[PDB]
Symmetry: C3
Subunit: 119 residues, 3 copies
């Protein structure tokens, strides 16, 4: 669920706040369109995609689904007690949070005018 | 709930995405004010007022209420097993998804700059 | 949870809608950054902070947590049946709703260009 995803990003990029990622580029934020502006935005495109696949499990609602995972020293893992929905949503979230820790954060790419950069 | 409404719009308007509707006109987004810029936006105004009505029943929280419905070949039905709030929120959404498939989508009305047109 | 925060604002400032606050200044919406534009925006900044403290309780998810409170003609109380998470989220909410009632509402600070005045 949404809070768990915010917590995974805390596990992996403790220095940044959730809101630095929530409105970044063309994809980290509601929807997405265009070509990802950089590698971080590319992480977001892969995550919007992954949620899309997860949503084909009937009744699987990514932002509301509570799953089971563990953070240990910057490492993330999805536990075995997850049902199929919970296991897919958790996997989407941990791959995005790991991806965000390895991308450079470009401040010029936060809160961009989507109308001019993301066709 | 929010995801079910998204899926009802996938049932009637398979060609468009939720985000196409989420920032359209003066009402389809967060709130609403002024004169519906067209017939799609008017579907949203009607949806906004139906949720206001639904919120009158104690503890009826429309975005969070899971209800029961069926999508069969582009047809939506709110099935009878679910309680007063559930029944009502289902009907609000059903009617809005039907309405969206009937109205034309004016691409020049997506994310209008609200101060100028919704007074 | 978010509908209960909406109803607390209705107890305290019955003459305004939820949406007048949802998009005000630098803080009242999603996130926040910058210098609070006025006393109402400062109420929101303190509330965003209060939620970050409440989120330090494991599993305490402010928008989703249902708590128990009473609205008695403009006064609010968080009731004693709340567990620690619910009591913390209720208090954040309560204090923000009381703060909103004592602040002047500035129509020119509604839905501002965040880029120009909040970073
Ligand atoms: Ca996105
Ligand atoms: Ca609306
Ligand atoms: Ca805020």
């Amino acid at each position: 669920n949404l809070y768990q995803f915010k917590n995974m990003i805390k596990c992996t990029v403790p220095s940044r706040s959730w809101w630095d990622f929530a409105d970044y580029g063309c994809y980290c934020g509601r929807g997405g369109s265009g070509t990802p502006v950089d590698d971080l935005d590319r992480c977001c495109q892969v995550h919007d995609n992954c949620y899309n696949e997860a949503e084909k499990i009937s009744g699987c609602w990514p932002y509301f689904k509570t799953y089971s995972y563990e953070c240990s020293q910057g490492t993330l893992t999805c536990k075995g007690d997850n049902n199929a929905c919970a296991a897919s949503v958790c996997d989407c979230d941990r791959l995005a949070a790991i991806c965000f820790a390895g991308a450079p954060y470009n401040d010029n790419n936060y809160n961009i005018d989507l109308k001019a950069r993301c066709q």
